[model samples]
Target chain A: QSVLTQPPSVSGAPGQRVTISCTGSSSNIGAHYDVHWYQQLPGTAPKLLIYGNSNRPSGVPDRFSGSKSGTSASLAITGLQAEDEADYYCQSYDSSLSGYVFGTGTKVTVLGQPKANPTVTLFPPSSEELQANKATLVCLISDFYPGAVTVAWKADSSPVKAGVETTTPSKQSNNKYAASSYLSLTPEQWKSHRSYSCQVTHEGSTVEKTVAPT
Target chain B: QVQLVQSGAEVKKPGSSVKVSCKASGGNFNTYTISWVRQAPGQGLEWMGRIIPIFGIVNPAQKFPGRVTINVDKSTNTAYMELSSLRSEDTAVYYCATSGVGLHFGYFDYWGQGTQVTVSSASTKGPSVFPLAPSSKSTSGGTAALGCLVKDYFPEPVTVSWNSGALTSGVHTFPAVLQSSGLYSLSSVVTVPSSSLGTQTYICNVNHKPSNTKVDKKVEPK
Candidate 1:
């Protein structure tokens, strides 16, 4: 009878911040301990909370956290607002059990306040080229807490910030859960030595992807 | 929000019987069912059974098995219970409850006010006659008085005899846990002092289904 652990995924406007939790162990969380969390965009499958109870999937946010206890676990989110509206669920473990346990999910609202300019960032973005090699590196920042970040690339060397794919879960440390997404880039493309940008989008900060010659 | 009120109190002879009633109000009376529960005289409470007003389904607790019947009347928004084989020990407070189906396992919630039932005349020990055999009736003592009186009677049979032990002169009381069926009952109690009474021990036994026997109690007097 052991509990699970969780991380606190939180975000907000320039002045507000929020926490959420997940609970239970092998016998309680799922039928067989194959538990996972997902962060869903407005109309999509969620992002991964932490799979196997504590590890985040490929490209998740730092604002999210995951941890376990005796026979249960918890997740939390801080600095909440109006844009952070979505559903959260704890994934099933050990598909052999053929079923999963779910908590009543929570919804976060990010209240937008005018006058304060908010920004975001992505960290450790690996380089990409158009000739031969492509690199897809992901960071689960939501597992850490405060804000989960994402990345993007510009092959035409235009404004790197426009037209990029991104997502922010409710950021509740308690209701941390989501699914996996692919970072589409080819090795032949990276070999061309193109400039790529990794925007680590936390509420007030941004970390751009570094450009390198392949 | 609907309201309900129940009337209490009933009295009966040893072989006679009685039924109690409860009325409901507040919401649509035709949509719900009424249930019955019981609290014995000076004992813990128990789930007696339930009655579907429209279907007349009577479901009693496992402990009362086959002993109680719950009935309901949709026309009057009332619930009724019939318990047969009236005996003094059947005396207890009965209640009417309204329940929903989501209780975990066999646990039930939602209760109502209670009614009281008191029965008597079941206490009679039947006629006691003098022994016909001269040897059995003859007392050669210088002077002695035969004082043999039965203290109580329960619907279930029991052995009630004098307490016989070394001290023979002290007053003793046996406080026992009591159980009951429609006509069968059981409880544990001790006999008063008197070594001679102990030797003449009589056992009160109630024969029930599955097993036709539950020795009410053993009275050892001294």
Candidate 2:
């Protein structure tokens, strides 16, 4: 759990007003320290939105604002636009840990933007030396919305457990998710399996890619 | 939506210094705090420190070397991290991560792509600039992408320009990537109108700071 807390998500329609709450404690927010807010659009780094007791920095639009009271602070987005659908996080320093603390992130969804499914691709082993030692295969998953995903590896229709690794999803240049997985095997083991598959389970649908040794 | 774009890779000699830039766009830059993290090729991640741009507050992690410094440039909406008195062990990929809002720190949900820093004893003070045998790739924008790849260079602030600076627009350069041999390689790409691609002559100039040894080459489209 995060030292601070926030709702998993909130939503609003165009032209509507929405508020996201970040909960803190006396050790931080109530300790007279100020709170800050950040907004993260898909595929880009989080940008500072609110700073220093509900202050908006240069270039920030007035429609977005922040406030703090007691052990809680709130981020408000009025006149919501489709582009405002992004992740929001609140930050403060907690004296208990003498370290900085961030609230659990909150996702602000703007209605009218439909959810997107992921695009999945599987690649054959690269030029790694397959000389009786080891080989590597990669599976790329990109451009998925709302970001949770699971990837599984299969060999000739059977689940393969060992030698598989999946990376955390990364936001891409587009407002979507990019993730990759790798399956490794000894040269002899690879030679024994003729068909390999990468299965991606996402949002009630499955995307699969199949490859084989040449 | 804020975008963080970092400078190209840096190759420095042991006992030297290197600086990198991370520029932010699409949002107010100075309103946030940014942190630097290091990842050595064969090791784990290290949190170097954090810089509060608005207040000019710099807090280096306990383990961070005293040689490290972090600051911001309001004029450019950029943050710079400079590490001096370098050693080979300092060679690593340095990423600039902005605090979501403080430290554990804030949701580090946003990050710059990264700046590559390679410090090696094998790399000397003055780097040797090399040939950039350019390559042309087809692009749908009615233009051809010309790529200039630099290799075996050490020490940076390396500069790559085209056509005597005539080809200023549409240029993108990537940070240098280290090789198994410890040499560094990087590339710059520029899109030129396809109509002038085939027979038009192109130029690539390579220069590095401190060395000032300039190198040049020309390649025709394939």
Candidate 3:
């Protein structure tokens, strides 16, 4: 990855057009005289979007196009689809600057994309937690849309943000996404008998699951 | 305190022979076993055997067994790789590297600046590289299997590598198939030690020499 410059994100509605750019100088895009682009879905490695500057690697949708000018290059995704809302990157070879120069990544957002609310589930620590003095709370989020969801924990219903470990949404067998957040606390805190809850948010909707000492 | 440098790159006529040099400049000039590695576009590096220029012993990988020769100039304390009757398949980057003899043996301690060799007649093309996705394929204990599927172009064999270098502990390439369209395609799989597999992000590089191009993809198990 060359560390070239690119926009942080671009958004568009389905059937609309979006462009992600990489800006370089005589050192890179301009120097190499050729640049390539890729579309990377979360969890999947990137697929070649455009190569040899503008040659379509395969029968990939013709709507995806690429071009370069001066010290900059751009990837054009026309008729963007909901499935196109993933990370995109560019690549080039610059012997003067180094070896390879991969573009700074940018995320494309397909607005008006269908959304799915999440189902939240919470799991308590194992039975032997008192002896170990540590308690773990596992909160899961499933059946979410757009994949980019958020998770928060609550202590006695007080929104807490400390010590939260989460996995990025992973595409499930159902084609929906699943993710989890983990909370670790001491048995003494669990015995404090406070109400602990896991709150998951997808888009404008939020769902939660709670666990209390037995 | 040992430094080794190899000869410059060359674009050669297919039938003409080529010679590459690896010169050393430390106290132990001809002491280490200097080895050679070859890589084609989209193909991972290949082990071509070694030469202890100090002793005159030569070992060549089977593919290079016929037309390849290794010699150490004890007079100059340098190693050389000379291949005769070169063909398009011989077009690749060959690197001269140093190997360990005892405790640190087998490891490439020092590597030569790679020299690119191109035989003008070779059929070169790039594959449609893609889909380094995570899929629950089969069964295993703590480890998972990963395959990089490359197809739709070629000169027959495509090479695979992890982390841009080497990690072949758990690796195999399926029988390459020739399509009706007159191109070649194959899938390669990898599964190895868990100690190095736990990382979230792994880099897989595919080398297809026919095109003088390499596709490197990042993989993470879901």
Scored by lDDT, the top model is 2
Ranking by DockQ: 2, 3, 1
TM-score of each: 0.28, 0.52, 0.47
Error of 2 at B68 (Å): 4.2
Name the best candidate (by DockQ).
Answer: 2
lDDT tens string, model 3, A17-68?
Answer: 8888888778777775678776766534345678766878555788889899
Predicted structure with the largest TM-score when compared to the true one: 2
- DockQ scores for all predicted structures: 0.01, 0.08, 0.01
- Candidate lDDT scores, in order, read 0.42, 0.71, 0.67
Cα lDDT tens digits for candidate 3, B117-193:
86764345687544333333221455555546564565655787777665766554444544444456555555544
Better of 1 and 3 by lDDT: 3
Candidate 2, residues B24-73, lDDT tens digits: the string is 99677788879886656533345677888767789876655678899898
The reply for model 3, stretches above 4 Å from the true place, is A41-46, A81-86, A109-113, A128-133, B1-222
Tell me the chain A TM-score of model 2: 0.72
